[PDB]
């Protein structure tokens, strides 16, 4: 894989937020006597795989066609561990388990699968002193976030260094291969234990392709405005406010609180800034000397995700602007810019005070020993030989 080097890179405390990098070549081949370029990076097959050998790929699903999910699976590079994080209907979940098993079996690779609403996991969490995801029903709430949270836990338990997420509503397995390799590419270019990689795909000049465009644009702005509010300079750096397909080294993943809804992606960035932007004093000694790199990689393969959702669009916007409005870094100027976008579209007339998004605190607080203690008689269930 050959990417561009980011021409500029926003600095913000110890966070280093790189400008978008285009991928020029999907597959760079095998390094020998190559002539060094200063404007782009070639990443060697070998090293990409070695990185993927330490990488967990979470595939979250809630009643997604089986064909699709199989498609996605066949597309994940061999070296990565697969975790299906399911929340499907009980029937479908079984079908998913059998699907994974055929797959892991035939391709001689380890995987894990689990279900969001599994009581075993709920007590596991709670024993490890992490009761926050559980609901009135005594089970973990439905929500992609809560699924990811549990996937993070497995990632942690399985000793993988990096976690990446790939959505299962992906028609193109070849795409998935790229996104996953691009994660590994990010982590290679990184020179910090604490790295994040976010995939985007921009569309350059309708119903779906048109008016979702102008919302990510707005969403992206509100992040840049948030940064601007602090540095005292405008910036156009953030282009991945929502980035479903994103990855992070586990060391950083466990450090970040997560939000509940569509708010999840945007929050991560806000969190990073609040935590490591040098404004509030910084506790974490190992981050203060290594810093955080954030990569934004522009993929060669389009994001084609099936749907039939309109009111997901409104919400997406709403959630992003919420996380910014309620940031401890939001200057008075930003807060109002944001509130005006909201009202002037769809949310509370007078009279707006957009719900503060609700935040699970970092997993760094979950005693992993307790969890290991608590699922001993079960780990062979989640595990798919």
Ligand X SMILES: Nc1nc2c(ncn2[C@@H]2O[C@H](COP(=O)(O)OP(=O)(O)O[C@H]3O[C@H](CO)[C@@H](O)[C@H](O)[C@@H]3O)[C@@H](O)[C@H]2O)c(=O)[nH]1
List of residues contacting its own copies (CB under 8 A): 2, 23-30, 34-35, 37-38, 40, 45, 49, 71, 74-75, 77-79, 103, 106-108, 171-178, 300-302
Angstrom distances, CA of residue 328 to CA of 47, 272, 274, 355: 40, 12, 7, 15
Interface with ligand X includes 169 (CB under 6 A)? yes
- With respect to Mg ion, which residue has the nearer C-beta, 170 or 220? 170
Interface with Mg ion includes 169 (CB under 5 A)? yes
Closest CB 5 distance from its own copies, rounded Å: 12
Q: Per DSSP, which regions of the chain are E strands?
A: 2-4, 9-12, 15-18, 21-25, 40-42, 55-61, 81-86, 111-115, 162-165, 194-200, 246-249, 258-259, 292-298, 359-360, 383-384
**Segment contacting ligand X by CB under 6 A, of 12-20, 34-42, 82-90, 339-347:** 82-90
Interface with Mg ion includes 143 (CB under 5 A)? no
Closest CB 53 distance from Zn ion, rounded Å: 22
- With respect to Zn ion, which residue has the nearer C-beta, 153 or 273? 273
Interface with ligand X includes 290 (CB under 6 A)? no
332-335 own/partner pairs: CB under 8 Å, 24+ apart: 333/229, 334/222, 334/225, 334/226, 334/228, 334/229
Structure token digits, residue 23: 């991928």
Task: Say which DSSP state 35 is in.
Answer: P
Closest CB 272 distance from ligand X, rounded Å: 17
**Segment contacting Zn ion by CB under 5 A, of 4-12, 68-76, 119-127, 220-228:** 4-12
Cα 117 to Cα 208: distance, rounded to the nearest angstrom: 32
Closest CB 306 distance from Mg ion, rounded Å: 7
Listed residue (11, 9, 81, 40) closest to 230, CA to CA: 11
Interface with ligand X includes 323 (CB under 6 A)? no
Site for Zn ion in 207-236 (CB under 5 A): 236
Neighbours of 103 (CB within 10 A): 19
Cα 175 to Cα 26: distance, rounded to the nearest angstrom: 10
End-to-end CA distance of the chain: 31
Interface with ligand X includes 92 (CB under 6 A)? no
Q: Which residues have CB under 8 Å from 327's CB, separation 6+?
A: 226, 270, 273, 274
Radius of gyration of the chain (CA): 20
User: Which of 14, 15, 83, 85 is the binder for ligand X (CB under 6 A)?
Assistant: 85
Closest CB 324 distance from ligand X, rounded Å: 15
Site for ligand X in 226-285 (CB under 6 A): 242-244, 262, 264-265
Please report, to the nearest 10 degrees, the dihedral formed by the alpha carbons of residues 264, 270, 271, 273 taken in order.
Answer: 150
The bridge status of strand 383-384 relative to strand 40-42 is unpaired
User: Which of 167, 178, 274, 341 is the binder for ligand X (CB under 6 A)?
Assistant: 167
The binding site for Zn ion (CB under 5 A) comprises: 7-8, 19, 236, 244-245, 286, 303
**Binding site for Zn(2+), residues?**
8, 19, 236, 245, 286, 290, 303, 305
- Interface contacts to ligand X, rule CB under 6 A: 60-62, 64, 85-87, 116, 142-144, 147, 167-169, 242-244, 262, 264-265, 305, 307, 309, 312
Please report, in range form, the residues annotated as the binding site for Mg(2+).
169
């Amino acid at each position: 894989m050959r990417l561009e080097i980011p021409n500029h890179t926003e600095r913000f405390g110890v966070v280093r937020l790189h400008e978008v990098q285009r991928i020029l070549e999907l597959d760079s081949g095998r390094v020998r006597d190559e002539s060094p370029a200063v404007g782009l990076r070639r990443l060697d097959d070998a090293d990409l795989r070695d990185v993927l050998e330490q990488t967990a790929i979470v595939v979250p699903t809630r009643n997604e066609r089986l064909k699709l999910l199989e498609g996605v699976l066949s597309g994940i590079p061999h070296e990565a561990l697969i975790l299906v994080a399911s929340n499907s209907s009980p029937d479908r979940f079984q079908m998913e388990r059998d699907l994974l098993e055929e797959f892991a079996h035939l391709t001689e690779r380890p995987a894990l699968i689990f279900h969001q609403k599994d009581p075993a996991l709920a007590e596991a969490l709670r024993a490890g002193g992490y009761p926050h995801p559980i609901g009135e029903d005594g089970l973990v709430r439905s929500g992609k976030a809560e699924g990811m949270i549990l996937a993070l836990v497995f990632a942690a338990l399985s000793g993988r260094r990096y976690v990446g997420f790939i959505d299962a509503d992906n028609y193109f397995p070849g795409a998935v291969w790229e996104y996953v390799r691009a994660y590994a590419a990010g982590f290679l270019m990184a020179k910090t234990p604490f790295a994040m990689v976010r995939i985007l795909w921009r569309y350059k000049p309708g119903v779906v392709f048109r008016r979702y465009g102008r919302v990510s644009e707005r969403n992206n702005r509100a992040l840049n405005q948030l940064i601007g509010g602090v540095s005292g300079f405008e910036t156009d750096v953030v282009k991945t406010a929502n980035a479903g397909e994103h990855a992070m080294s586990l060391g950083l993943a466990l450090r970040l609180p997560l939000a509940s809804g569509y708010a999840v992606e945007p929050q991560e960035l806000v969190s990073l800034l609040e935590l490591y932007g040098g404004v509030f004093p910084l506790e974490d000694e190992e981050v203060l000397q290594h810093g955080v790199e954030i990569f934004q990689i522009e993929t060669r393969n389009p994001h084609l995700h099936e749907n039939k959702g309109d009111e997901h669009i409104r919400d997406m916007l709403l959630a992003c602007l919420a996380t910014v409005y309620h940031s401890k870094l939001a200057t008075e100027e930003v807060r109002q810019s944001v509130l005006e976008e909201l009202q002037a579209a769809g949310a509370l007339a007078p009279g707006e005070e957009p719900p503060p998004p609700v935040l699970y605190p970092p997993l760094s607080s979950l005693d992993l020993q307790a969890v290991r203690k608590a699922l001993r008689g079960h780990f062979s269930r989640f595990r798919v030989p």
